[PDB]
Amino acid sequence: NTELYVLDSSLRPLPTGAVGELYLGGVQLARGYVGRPGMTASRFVANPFGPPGSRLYRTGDLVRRRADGAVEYLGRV
Amino acid sequence: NPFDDDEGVFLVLVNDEDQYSLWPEFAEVPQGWRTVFGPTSRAAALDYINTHWT
């Protein structure tokens, strides 16, 4: 169950029409095995918005939110 | 992006499930996460995570 976030470089949510980076919430990865811990820790980061201990998927993609709340894709950073 | 910024200053966070997260020091630590290392360079934080997330 994924939530879409549009954040600035300070990890703050952005208003309608502002250009930011897409982060995905509700992410779950395998718990038993982490073969690439550093890359994982840089790609799936602590979530300031979800439940305690949750993580955000840092997509590295540029997006902006429309008036109806939907997300428009603008290309990879 | 702050998580890719080699000029950044970083902390290492862990949650109650022993998962790790890189973190820029300027940002508030989210609930459910505690700091175990830093402030330090990006390379040293990633070194710590590769050392301890085993």
- CATH code of the domain containing B17: 3.90.820.10
Q: How far is CA B12 from CA A29, B42, B49, in A?
A: 19, 10, 7
Could A48 and B30 be called an inter-chain contact, meaning their C-beta atoms sit closer than 8 Å? yes
Backbone angles phi, psi at B21, to 5 degrees: -145, 130
Q: Read off the DSSP letter of residue A26.
A: S
**Cis peptide upstream of residue A13 (ω within 30 degrees of 0):** no
Which residues of chain A neighbour B14 with C-beta distances below 8 Å?
A: none
Name the residue range of residue A36's domain: 1-77
Method of determination used here: X-ray
Is the sign of the CA dihedral A72, B26, B5, B21 positive or negative? negative
> What is the count of structural domains for chain A?
1
Name the residue range of residue B9's domain: 1-54
Question: In which residue are the tokens 């590769």 written?
Answer: B50
CA A13 – CA B32 distance, rounded (Å): 20
Q: How many CA atoms lie within 13 A of A14 on its CB side?
A: 23
Q: Between B1, B2, B49, which is nearest A41 by CB?
A: B49
